[PDB]
Design an enzyme around this catalytic site. Structure first.
Site, PDB file in Angstrom:
ATOM      1  N   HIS A 165       0.813  -1.233   0.000  1.00 36.50           N
ATOM      2  CA  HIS A 165       0.000   0.000   0.000  1.00 36.50           C
ATOM      3  C   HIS A 165       0.838   1.271   0.000  1.00 36.50           C
ATOM      4  O   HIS A 165       0.330   2.312  -0.414  1.00 36.50           O
ATOM      5  CB  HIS A 165      -0.941   0.021   1.239  1.00 36.50           C
ATOM      6  CG  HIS A 165      -1.501   1.393   1.525  1.00 36.50           C
ATOM      7  ND1 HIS A 165      -2.803   1.746   1.236  1.00 36.50           N
ATOM      8  CD2 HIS A 165      -0.950   2.479   2.134  1.00 36.50           C
ATOM      9  CE1 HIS A 165      -3.015   3.004   1.597  1.00 36.50           C
ATOM     10  NE2 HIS A 165      -1.903   3.475   2.137  1.00 36.50           N
ATOM     11  N   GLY A 174      -0.065   5.553  10.760  1.00 36.33           N
ATOM     12  CA  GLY A 174       1.372   5.528  10.642  1.00 36.33           C
ATOM     13  C   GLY A 174       1.978   4.236  11.131  1.00 36.33           C
ATOM     14  O   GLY A 174       3.190   4.043  10.984  1.00 36.33           O
ATOM     15  N   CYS A 210       1.301   1.145  10.065  1.00 36.66           N
ATOM     16  CA  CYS A 210       1.426  -0.046   9.263  1.00 36.66           C
ATOM     17  C   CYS A 210       2.880  -0.333   8.902  1.00 36.66           C
ATOM     18  O   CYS A 210       3.751   0.555   8.879  1.00 36.66           O
ATOM     19  CB  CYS A 210       0.536  -0.022   8.053  1.00 36.66           C
ATOM     20  SG  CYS A 210       0.875   1.463   7.138  1.00 36.66           S
TER      21      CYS A 210
HETATM   22  C1  LIG Z   1      -0.648   1.414   6.162  1.00 40.44           C
HETATM   23  S1  LIG Z   1      -0.987   0.884   7.868  1.00 40.44           S
HETATM   24  C2  LIG Z   1      -0.963   0.312   5.069  1.00 40.44           C
HETATM   25  O1  LIG Z   1      -0.241  -0.545   4.787  1.00 40.44           O
HETATM   26  C3  LIG Z   1      -2.326   0.109   4.475  1.00 40.44           C
HETATM   27  C4  LIG Z   1      -2.749  -1.124   3.974  1.00 40.44           C
HETATM   28  C5  LIG Z   1      -4.080  -1.205   3.520  1.00 40.44           C
HETATM   29  C6  LIG Z   1      -4.951  -0.098   3.576  1.00 40.44           C
HETATM   30  C7  LIG Z   1      -4.490   1.099   4.126  1.00 40.44           C
HETATM   31  C8  LIG Z   1      -5.276   2.404   4.245  1.00 40.44           C
HETATM   32  O2  LIG Z   1      -5.194   3.124   5.197  1.00 40.44           O
HETATM   33  N1  LIG Z   1      -6.071   2.831   3.139  1.00 40.44           N
HETATM   34  C9  LIG Z   1      -6.754   4.098   3.301  1.00 40.44           C
HETATM   35  C10 LIG Z   1      -6.524   4.970   2.053  1.00 40.44           C
HETATM   36  C11 LIG Z   1      -5.094   5.506   1.820  1.00 40.44           C
HETATM   37  C12 LIG Z   1      -4.251   5.791   2.895  1.00 40.44           C
HETATM   38  C13 LIG Z   1      -2.965   6.285   2.674  1.00 40.44           C
HETATM   39  C14 LIG Z   1      -2.506   6.500   1.376  1.00 40.44           C
HETATM   40  C15 LIG Z   1      -3.342   6.220   0.295  1.00 40.44           C
HETATM   41  C16 LIG Z   1      -4.628   5.730   0.520  1.00 40.44           C
HETATM   42  C17 LIG Z   1      -8.224   3.765   3.576  1.00 40.44           C
HETATM   43  O3  LIG Z   1      -9.072   4.465   3.114  1.00 40.44           O
HETATM   44  O4  LIG Z   1      -8.567   2.627   4.349  1.00 40.44           O
HETATM   45  C18 LIG Z   1      -8.536   2.800   5.746  1.00 40.44           C
HETATM   46  C19 LIG Z   1      -3.197   1.176   4.571  1.00 40.44           C
END
Ligand SMILES: *[C@H](S)C(=O)c1cccc(C(=O)N[C@@H](Cc2ccccc2)C(=O)OC)c1
Ligand SMILES: *[C@H](S)C(=O)c1cccc(C(=O)N[C@@H](Cc2ccccc2)C(=O)OC)c1
Lengths: 301, 301
Positions: A41, A143, A145
């Site tokens: 991600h 923050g 993840c």
């Molecule tokens: C960070 S903990 C990570 O690895 C991760 C994995 C899956 C989903 C998300 C996440 O927070 N997605 C959000 C959207 C987003 C956040 C940051 C940058 C781009 C897009 C979301 O909407 O779901 C909670 C993070």
């Protein structure tokens, strides 16, 4: 004496945590040998999270788009690839603090320590259990993840979890270190939710043995039960069925306390049907299911 | 989201733990710069514990009677001295892993992380609170004395506790790093016992704020109370009195949640008088008092 939710010492893990930044997204990574592992991600944009095709997103990136910082030292990325839901960033420096390690996928009902990190900096350590529904009840803020879960045996760190996201009920989901999710969850925006959960029976019995080892005996009784009659009660109260393997695994604690497993199961049946009547066990007023038989033996020796 | 009993990452402490042996007694020590700190009980024999005169026992020892091992490396002792109930062993090597550190004595109601160790090897890390009666509810087995408690701020380790012994109720007593005991306890065999304890009110209120931040609201009500009327209730249930300083310290959490401190005190009064009626808060069926306002802010930001 005493019984606490105890995590493994985290130093070996701390020396592996780094910060990974791609565009404006910053998260944590795990640096072992000359590879940095992190959630894929990191390459997404905010508007990408609606059915992102990660193979397309990654093909459009180059090594220079990944900024990896270990403490105050930037590591040069010299290769990138995807493995399931984790990114593998090859760097030009092997981590001199790499411990002996393994990547091991755990089962529901097993416990592990979590080193919560932000911006590649460790913040706290705590114990977690993988729930029957493949979530974990963690403590994670934005923050976090890329923070990892692990067990340590002798000098070997067995990494088992990488944090990815929070579900709507506040519980957490992630993958193994090969990037495969625990449970029916995905790294994109959907209405996904934790499924129904159950209580981990064998762990509750392990914890009742810890309590006896530590002097809490009020819940003991002279009765025994059969495994079948016990599992009829377990099913009624949303407890997992108890197998003969579970009974076998409880063997050492039964021998140490002199309380047969089925004897302790009769006590658990009474606690489920009657409640606690104002008393506590090991400082809790609920039946605790996040300690495995191994956790008890390690701490209560 | 989530709320766990979280310890500080222990790596900085792990690099300070050593094994100290004198005659047939082996325990843990803390190696900082060129000094190793450990409980002075290491110099006692089993028959010495009846009113030992430690100044006499130490005068009869020489440097070569102390075996200090750091991992697999023996450190040569080049001086020894006593400070209150801790022994200071000067060694001929400064620990290259010494962190920035301070020795700070804590107050009852404050929390700290404990790195439980055996034979100079770290085993587990957990959070503890100093109880009003100056004991701690730890998890310690034979061989754990000399294990230390600490908080970490920025990169500075503030050591606050060294483990010495277990009292008859299974709770634990020790000293500060200057060797002064917390509480009315001594390092010799007596019938000493923990005194009466109380619940740490300000911490319970901090934890109710954590619960609200994390979505548990069922215990909220439209009422408020005065500080005096609240403290009449606190006294009845063996809770510490709440001061205006406590109210002030809860200021940030009150502002964050929009729930006035006295408003939350009305909820706590209701919980004390009525109980939980089958519900839980932050996964507990009891009111938790081992999280300080600072602990909540750090974890719930
Ligand atoms: C960070 S903990 C990570 O690895 C991760 C994995 C899956 C989903 C998300 C996440 O927070 N997605 C959000 C959207 C987003 C956040 C940051 C940058 C781009 C897009 C979301 O909407 O779901 C909670 C993070
Ligand atoms: C080890 S955790 C330590 O520092 C310590 C401080 C105070 C008291 C004791 C202790 O265990 N004393 C026992 C007697 C003893 C033990 C080991 C060697 C010599 C004597 C005791 O009887 O009290 C529990 C340990």
């Amino acid at each position: 004496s005493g019984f606490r939710k105890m995590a493994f010492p985290s130093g070996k893990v701390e020396g592996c945590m780094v910060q990974v930044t791609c565009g404006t997204t910053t998260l944590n990574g795990l640096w072992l040998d000359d590879v940095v592992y992190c959630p894929r991600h990191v390459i997404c944009t905010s508007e990408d999270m609606l059915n992102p095709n990660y193979e397309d997103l990654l093909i459009r990136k180059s090594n220079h788009n990944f900024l990896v910082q270990a403490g105050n030292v930037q590591l040069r990325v010299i290769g990138h690839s995807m493995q399931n839901c984790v990114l593998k960033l090859k760097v030009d420096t092997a981590n001199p603090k790499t411990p002996k390690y393994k990547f091991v996928r755990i089962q529901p009902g097993q416990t592990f320590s979590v080193l919560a990190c932000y911006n590649g900096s460790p913040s706290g350590v705590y114990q977690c259990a993988m729930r029957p529904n493949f979530t974990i009840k963690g403590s994670f803020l934005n923050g976090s993840c890329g923070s990892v879960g692990f067990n340590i045996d002798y000098d070997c760190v067995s990494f088992c979890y990488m944090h990815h996201m929070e579900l709507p009920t506040g519980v957490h989901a992630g993958t193994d270190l090969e990037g495969n999710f625990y449970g029916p969850f995905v790294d994109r925006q959907t209405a996904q939710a934790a499924g129904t959960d159950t209580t981990i029976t064998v762990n509750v019995l392990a914890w009742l043995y810890a309590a006896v080892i530590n002097g809490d005996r009020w819940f003991l009784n002279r009765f025994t039960t059969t495994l079948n009659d016990f599992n009829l009660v377990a099913m009624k109260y949303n407890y997992e069925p108890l197998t003969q393997d579970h009974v076998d695994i409880l063997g050492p604690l039964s021998a140490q306390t002199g309380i047969a497993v089925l004897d302790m199961c009769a006590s658990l049946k009474e606690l489920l049907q009657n409640g606690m009547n104002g008393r506590t066990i090991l400082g809790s007023a609920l039946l605790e299911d996040e300690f495995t038989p191994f956790d008890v033996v390690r701490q209560c020796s």
